[PDB]
Enzyme design. Structure first.
Site, PDB file in Angstrom:
ATOM      1  CG  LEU A   1       2.201 -13.246  -0.317  1.00 32.59           C
ATOM      2  CD1 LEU A   1       2.436 -14.739  -0.382  1.00 32.59           C
ATOM      3  CD2 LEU A   1       0.812 -12.978   0.223  1.00 32.59           C
ATOM      4  CG  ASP A   2       4.347  -7.914   5.861  1.00 33.19           C
ATOM      5  OD1 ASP A   2       5.164  -7.135   5.321  1.00 33.19           O
ATOM      6  OD2 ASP A   2       3.914  -7.760   7.016  1.00 33.19           O
ATOM      7  CB  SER A   3       8.707  -9.541   6.463  1.00 35.32           C
ATOM      8  OG  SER A   3       7.927  -9.339   7.626  1.00 35.32           O
TER       9      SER A   3
END
Ligand SMILES: CCCCCCCCCCCCCCCCCC(=O)OC[C@H](COP(=O)([O-])OCC(O)COP(=O)([O-])OC[C@@H](COC(=O)CCCCCCCCCCCCCCCCC)OC(=O)CCCCCCCCCCCCCCCCC)OC(=O)CCCCCCCCCCCCCCCCC
Ligand SMILES: CCCCCCCCCCCCCCCCCC(=O)OC[C@H](COP(=O)(O)OCCN)OC(=O)CCCCCCCCCCCCCCCCC
Lengths: 84, 446, 112, 144, 108, 48, 151, 85, 59, 48, 134
Positions: free
Chosen positions: H39-41
């Site tokens: 899960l990215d920023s």
């Protein structure tokens, strides 16, 4: 136990009521929708039926009884002796 | 009235005899009950003893004085807890009681002034002998010298009146009228300080803040009223001179009223709110009084009486917080509805009476005073509206913030409501509802 | 048949609540007079408020009898209401006809 | 101690006093900023707060006394009231400026008011006749 | 971020959080039951400044103009208006222009 | 549900007689109805 | 008894009036002693005009007469007000029927009451009232009807 | 009705199984957002935002950064609602 | 709060009696509405005809 | 809630003036009394 | 327990910006079918400029913040049972020592509770002694 929760296997984004259509009208943008699976239990058949059907259910809840009881009262004022 | 006087003198010994705090208390209430029974007066002077009389104006004032003077002992019991010279306390109270009776019944102006200014001492004992704040010293300096610095000078006016008149019974002055333009200021202003006036309000917040529950109750409950009672008796012959120079006094009172109400909003101390509030109400009383119209005067008598009662009860409330949470601040005191909900009822009621909510002898006042002022000058309405508006405004804030918000985190376990305080609050308010049935005795004195 | 034309011709349109001003012309309508039925003495005892104490009051007191008779079910007292409002309605017809009558009597002399 | 024990000192006039006062109020050396002490000043009392509002302060921060959103020893602003959530204060910047709020209200009020009075001059109606009243000497004519 | 201004405040200012807890949870002075509150400097500071700031008051142009327009001009103007209107009204009254019919407040 | 009926039959001894133009008495119904049209239309919205 | 509920309201009126009037005749008449209470008649007094420059007792007597007379005339205004009050309540149409014929008595009463007592304020005794009349008589004779300015 | 700790767990699990952009099989319940979920920023707060709507309260802005695992989310919901017991 | 709290489902199908309560509540409204409608349908119309100013001949 | 839904209907229709309910008995009679009595433009248009 | 520091990273100034934006979509669009469309349309607007220089990020905040502030719903979807709710914080409860001051007859209704209350109290004293060794 308060309640129960399904597994979410049933929650298919392929929910028919034009959630695929907005998927298409997104598809022209073509980005994605990851949470859309939530809206499956949301717009599910026989939960709330159609909005027009719901409006039918609401705006007409007892019209049939009203007209029937109305016709009975019409017969009463017609034959009981009120006359015209 | 010597019946009352001799009763009080024969009550004085109980101060010496040990463990007579409660026996004295019941007696003071009992004699108040007796003085209640003695009631037949008209406008003329009545019950003319050697030099003591009584009248509509004096009868109610005395009843309040006996009433409040008995309620002292309900209010203050920490003196007994501490054994802080209960004997001197009881002696100080009774001495004060006698002086008030003799002040309000002195049919001579000079006898009146004599007891009036004799009361300077016992009150000063009451603050100083049982004060709490270190400010108690400078406060006593403010109280005594603001008073004496003008209360002494009327002594000349009194003697000047003698020389031109030949006596000092009140009816005798009324027959004459003086317009030398210094007699007026010398007597008027001298009373105005004790009234007090907004420009000389200065001392009064200090005296109340650093004084015990008892002293503050006395200060706001009689002293201010006693100044007014003198006015009612004395302005009879100051009329012409008053008419020439009256706009100044009514102006500063009305102007000061809205200001001091805004001081109340911004203020952050229970006694400070009430102290400033009491100045505000006595501002309107001073206004209607200086109108001198029938409506003004007969209403002034009522508002003095009702204001004294409400101010006392609010002080008992302030004492309650001060005696539980040990700090006068708005900030520390809060959310008490959760700790004494049956008490917050009384908080609301006493607040209600101070904002003139009926059935309330206070309210009965403002109808009379406001009618007088409005008739006197339509211009007043532009400030009368705001004066009452901000009057209720700070009272709302006082009631809400003190009783409503979420509790304070750092608060060490303190006992709950108790019969003494409960009965104390009923006793100050319930008569304030009673009187409206028979206002005619408290409403008609002219 | 509206009121906006007043602002354009504040003369031509008679105005509101306006008394007749050409009734002397008897070559047209209004040759007979009013008629009074309910005497003001009975009307006085009727307590009919003055706003209604006008020519349509005989039926009004008649209705009051109906309603004071069978008050618990006023709905039965229908025909008395039916007639009373009709008698008022005829008065309203006269109100309009008076408006246009003084309009007519105005117009025939406007340009003359 | 008592109030006279806690009385604030006069405005600090050299840097050492600034260091001392900031400690007196537990403030950091830059955090401390005394009032202008120009003639109506408290002197050494720090000038804090005075922002848009107290409720603008953190909603969820751990507060010793949540009541005023206040931690322990910390100099209370001289105008704690007049900025408290119970008094003049909000949580977020306003959308517009003062003239906007008053102008949008009052400009509309003046115009609609004046345009009404203009239209009262032309008060419409139903063209009906004057209400007839029986009375002595009144002889309205029946359409007959 | 000033390079640790937030941090520098952080260290000390989080210490007295625990002492507040120790005071609040103090079973002993809560057991004494005498009432009272954990001492708080900001409160004590606030009361003292609230009661005393005259020793700071310098009577300069600012304070004078502030006070002058705060009450003085209000008091003077309002009093002058009151006296002026009353002088006119009473002047009519002592001239006898308005008889005992028109006048109002016949009963105060 | 019965509503004003009980009052309407027992409050007005002198019911106000109103014989107005048809384009006014009925107008009270349709200037009324267009509001509900808008209230249930402006709410009903298609996605895009 | 034409109307139904009015033909019923009477029934509760019989219910309410019943026990009370029975109580009046049952436990009052056999338990009441007869006694009489009259109404003052204060003798007149030599008013301020009569009394001497310094006759303090006499002046005090005059003022008390003035006060009681004030309290009555003070009242006669009220009664006339109450009287007019009834008339305006008489009948809904009946306002102009007897307002002016009845009110004007109250109007005259107010103005007369003002002239005698009005404009003095509290503390006002017989002396200030009496001399005010003297002043008004002088004004009437010199400058004419009050309500004309001066010449 | 009260709230049951096991049902809180299954419920966060239900939404997690529901969320497409997460590894579909919903790997180990203790899946760190940047490790295996990837899960990215921004994807992290999309997780928090759905959890909000599901559980009827905002999570504090920084306190989301404290939430670094579905175990944390249960642990944060538990601290709120008295779920330990 | 409430003894029925479902999860991601419609209402727990309630009794017919409560269903009967609602249907009758709406039905009573309708019954009276048509009741008044047939008994005085003219009321919605102006109870009196509207004569015309021009149609009024000049006597 | 078919009961609360139905009841909320009755409130709507009484307030909405659907015929022969509370609004119709009351809102109606007012509006044509506005017509009967001479009134101002805005007051007229604004009611409707 | 730990009270966090107030320092903030540009990532957070940008992501919590995305959070507030999602909220601002809610307050301006409700229908979940409509929402997810526009919320994902929003994502593209946060995705097309994913990685830019810091300076452009500052201008990106200079625009982003204004959009929220200038396009904020006048009635934001304030949350029901949280801070700022329409009924949140409805009542409060006082510290337990209020229960300590019940009149003995008042105490005499729940002896089992008060007995266990007494026990837990002493055990708390032991706990607080531990809390910093007294
Ligand atoms: C007088 C008197 O006090 O007699 C006792 C009693 C008041 O105590 P209570 O009725 O037992 O209060 C309820 C419980 O005690 C429980 O009372 P509580 O502890 O829950 O507190 C409720 C309330 C206590 O007061 C009330 O609950 C309302 C009752 C009137 C006071 O006091 C508060 O804490 C709320 C703040 C007060 C708000 C002011 C409400 C009075 C407005 C007056 C308007 C006139 O008054 C009566 O006997 C009859 C009161 C009924 C109203 C008639 C008017 C008097
Ligand atoms: C026009 C009639 C308006 C009536 C309201 C008068 C203004 C005072 C008032 O009570 O209004 C509410 C006001 C603000 O309260 P509110 O905004 O709801 O919450 C606190 C926000 N910080 O409450 C207050 O802030 C209290 C302010 C004290 C009263 C000052 C009133 C000034 C009157 C005009 C000058």
């Amino acid at each position: 136990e308060p309640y129960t929760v399904p597994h979410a296997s049933t929650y298919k984004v392929e929910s028919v009521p034009q959630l695929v259509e907005v998927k298409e009208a997104l598809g022209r943008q073509g980005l994605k929708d990851p949470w859309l699976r939530n809206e499956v239990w949301r717009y599910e058949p026989k939960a709330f039926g159609t909005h027009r059907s719901r409006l039918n259910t609401f705006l007409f809840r007892g019209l049939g009884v009203g007209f029937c009881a109305f016709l009975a009262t019409v017969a009463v004022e017609y034959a009981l002796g009120i006359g015209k | 009235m010597l019946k009352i006087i001799f009763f009080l003198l024969f009550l004085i010994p109980f101060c010496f005899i040990n463990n007579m705090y409660w026996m004295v208390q019941i007696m003071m209430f009992f004699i108040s009950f007796i003085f209640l029974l003695m009631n037949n007066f008209m406008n003329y002077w009545s019950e003319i003893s050697y030099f003591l009389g009584c009248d509509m104006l004096s009868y109610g004032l005395i009843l309040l004085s006996l009433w409040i003077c008995s309620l002292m002992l309900l209010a203050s019991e920490m003196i007994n807890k501490h054994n802080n010279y209960k004997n001197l306390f009881l002696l100080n109270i009774i001495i004060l009681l006698l002086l008030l009776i003799l002040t309000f019944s002195s049919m001579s102006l000079f006898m009146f002034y004599l007891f009036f200014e004799s009361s300077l001492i016992p009150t000063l004992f009451l603050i100083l002998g049982w004060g709490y704040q270190p400010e108690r010293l400078q406060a006593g300096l403010y109280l005594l010298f603001y008073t004496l610095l003008v209360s002494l000078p009327m002594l000349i006016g009194i003697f000047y009146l003698m020389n031109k008149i030949g006596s000092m019974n009140f009816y005798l002055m009324n027959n004459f009228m003086f317009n030398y333009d210094l007699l007026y200021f010398c007597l008027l202003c001298a009373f105005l300080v004790k009234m007090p006036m907004f420009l000389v309000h200065l001392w009064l917040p200090k005296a109340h803040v650093e004084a015990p529950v008892s002293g503050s109750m006395i200060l706001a409950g009689i002293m201010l009223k006693l100044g007014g009672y003198g006015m009612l008796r004395v302005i009879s012959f100051l009329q012409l001179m008053n008419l020439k120079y009256s706009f100044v006094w009514i102006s500063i009172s009305l102007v000061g009223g809205v200001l001091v109400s805004l001081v109340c909003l911004r203020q952050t101390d229970l006694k400070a709110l009430i102290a400033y509030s009491s100045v505000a109400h006595m501002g309107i009383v001073l206004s209607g009084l200086l109108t001198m119209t029938y409506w003004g005067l007969c209403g002034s008598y009522t508002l003095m009486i009702a204001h004294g009662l409400c101010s006392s009860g609010l002080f008992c409330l302030a004492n309650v917080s001060y005696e539980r949470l040990g700090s006068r601040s708005m900030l520390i005191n809060k959310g008490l509805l959760n700790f004494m909900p049956s008490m917050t009822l009384w908080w609301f009621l006493l607040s209600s009476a101070n904002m003139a909510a009926p059935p309330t002898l206070n309210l009965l006042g403002e109808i009379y005073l406001l009618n007088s002022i409005v008739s006197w000058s339509w211009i007043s309405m532009i400030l009368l509206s705001f004066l009452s508006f901000f009057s209720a405004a700070y009272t709302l804030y006082l009631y809400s913030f003190s009783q409503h918000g979420k509790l304070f985190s750092g608060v060490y376990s303190f006992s709950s409501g108790k019969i003494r305080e409960y009965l104390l609050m009923l006793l100050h308010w319930l008569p304030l509802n009673l009187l409206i049935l028979k206002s005619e005795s408290f409403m008609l004195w002219l | 048949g509206n009121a906006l034309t007043h602002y354009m011709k504040p003369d031509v349109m008679p105005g509101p609540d306006v008394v007749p001003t050409f009734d002397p012309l008897l070559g047209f309508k209004s040759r007979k007079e009013r008629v009074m039925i309910a005497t003001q003495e009975e009307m006085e005892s009727a307590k009919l408020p003055l706003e209604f104490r006008d020519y349509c009051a005989h039926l009004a007191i008649a209705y009051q009898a109906c309603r004071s008779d069978t008050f618990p079910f006023v709905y039965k007292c229908a025909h008395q209401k039916h007639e009373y409002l009709t008698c008022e309605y005829e008065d309203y017809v006269l109100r309009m006809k008076e408006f246009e009558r003084e309009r007519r009597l105005l117009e025939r002399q406007k340009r003359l | 101690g008592w109030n006279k024990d806690y009385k604030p000192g006069p405005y600090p006039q050299t840097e050492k006093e600034r260091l001392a006062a900031a400690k007196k109020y537990y403030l950091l050396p830059e955090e401390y900023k005394p009032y202008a002490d120009d003639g109506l000043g408290y002197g050494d009392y720090p000038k804090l707060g005075y922002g848009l509002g107290v409720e603008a302060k953190d909603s969820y921060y751990p507060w010793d006394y949540p009541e005023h959103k206040r931690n322990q020893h910390e100099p209370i602003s001289a105008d704690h009231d007049l900025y408290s959530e119970d008094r003049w204060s909000q949580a977020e910047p306003p959308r517009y400026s003062n003239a906007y709020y008053f102008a949008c209200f009052l400009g509309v009020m003046s115009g609609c008011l004046a345009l009404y009075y203009w239209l009262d001059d032309k008060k419409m109606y139903r063209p009906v006749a004057a209400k007839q009243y029986p009375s002595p000497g009144v002889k309205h004519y029946t359409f007959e | 971020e000033e390079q640790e201004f937030i941090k520098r405040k952080h260290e000390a200012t989080l210490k007295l959080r625990q002492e507040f807890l120790k005071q609040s949870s103090n079973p002993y002075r809560h057991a004494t039951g005498e009432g009272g509150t954990v001492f708080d400097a900001g409160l004590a500071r606030f009361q003292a400044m609230r009661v005393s700031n005259y020793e700071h008051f310098k009577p300069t142009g600012k304070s004078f103009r502030t006070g002058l327009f705060a009450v003085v001009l209000p008091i003077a103007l309002y009093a002058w208006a009151l006296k002026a209107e009353r002088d006119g009204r009473e002047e009519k009254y002592r001239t006898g222009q308005v008889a005992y019919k028109d006048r109002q407040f016949k009963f105060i | 549900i019965i509503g004003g009926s009980m009052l309407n039959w027992l409050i007005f001894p002198f019911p106000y007689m109103i014989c107005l133009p048809i384009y006014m008495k009925l107008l009270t119904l349709f200037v009324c109805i267009v509001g509900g049209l808008f209230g249930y239309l402006i709410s009903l919205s298609n996605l895009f | 008894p034409r109307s139904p509920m009015a033909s019923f309201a009477e029934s509760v009126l019989n219910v309410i009036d019943g026990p009370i009037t029975w109580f009046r005749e049952s436990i009052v008449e056999p338990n009441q002693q007869k006694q009489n209470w009259y109404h003052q008649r204060f003798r007149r007094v030599p008013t301020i005009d009569q009394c001497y420059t310094d006759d303090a007792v006499c002046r005090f007597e005059a003022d008390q007469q003035f006060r009681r007379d004030r309290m009555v005339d003070n009242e006669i205004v009220n009664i006339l007000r109450q009287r007019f009050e009834d008339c305006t309540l008489y009948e809904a149409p009946d306002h102009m029927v007897k307002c002016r014929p009845l009110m004007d008595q109250y109007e005259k009463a107010t103005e007369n009451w003002f002239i005698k007592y009005g404009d003095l304020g509290g503390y006002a005794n017989a002396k200030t009232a009496y001399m005010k009349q003297k002043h008004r008589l002088i004004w009437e004779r010199r400058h004419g009807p009050v309500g004309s300015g001066m010449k | 009705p009260p709230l049951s700790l096991k049902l809180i767990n299954e419920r966060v699990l239900l939404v997690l199984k529901l969320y497409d952009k997460i590894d579909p099989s919903k790997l180990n319940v203790e899946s760190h957002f940047i490790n295996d979920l990837g899960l990215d920023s921004l994807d992290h707060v999309e997780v928090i935002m759905a959890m909000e709507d599901e559980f009827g309260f905002e999570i504090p802005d920084s306190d989301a950064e404290k939430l670094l695992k579905p175990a944390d989310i249960i642990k944060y919901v538990a601290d709120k609602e008295d779920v330990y017991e | 709060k409430s003894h029925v709290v479902s999860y991601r489902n419609g209402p727990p199908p309630h009794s017919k009696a409560t269903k009967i309560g609602a249907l009758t509540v709406g039905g009573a409204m309708w019954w009276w509405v048509i009741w008044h409608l047939w008994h005085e349908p003219d009321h919605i119309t102006g109870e009196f005809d509207y004569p015309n100013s021009r149609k009024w001949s000049n006597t | 809630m078919p009961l609360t839904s139905a009841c909320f209907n009755v409130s709507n229709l009484a307030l909405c003036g659907m015929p022969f309910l509370a609004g119709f008995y009351s809102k109606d009679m007012i509006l044509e009394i506005v017509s009967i009595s001479n009134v101002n433009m805005f007051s007229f248009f604004l009611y409707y | 327990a730990q009270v966090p520091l107030a320092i903030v990273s540009h990532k957070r100034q940008v992501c919590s910006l995305y959070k507030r934006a999602l909220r601002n979509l809610e307050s301006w669009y409700d229908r979940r079918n409509v929402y997810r469309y526009r919320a994902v349309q929003l994502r593209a607007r946060f995705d097309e400029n994913r990685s830019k220089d810091l300076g452009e990020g500052i201008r990106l905040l200079a625009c982003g913040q204004r959009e929220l502030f200038e396009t904020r719903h006048f009635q934001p979807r304030n949350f029901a049972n949280s801070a700022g709710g329409c009924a949140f914080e409805r009542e409060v409860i006082p510290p337990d020592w209020v229960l300590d001051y019940w009149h003995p007859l008042e105490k005499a209704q729940y002896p089992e509770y008060f007995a266990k209350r007494e026990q837990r109290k002493k055990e708390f004293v032991t706990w607080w002694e531990k809390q910093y060794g007294k």
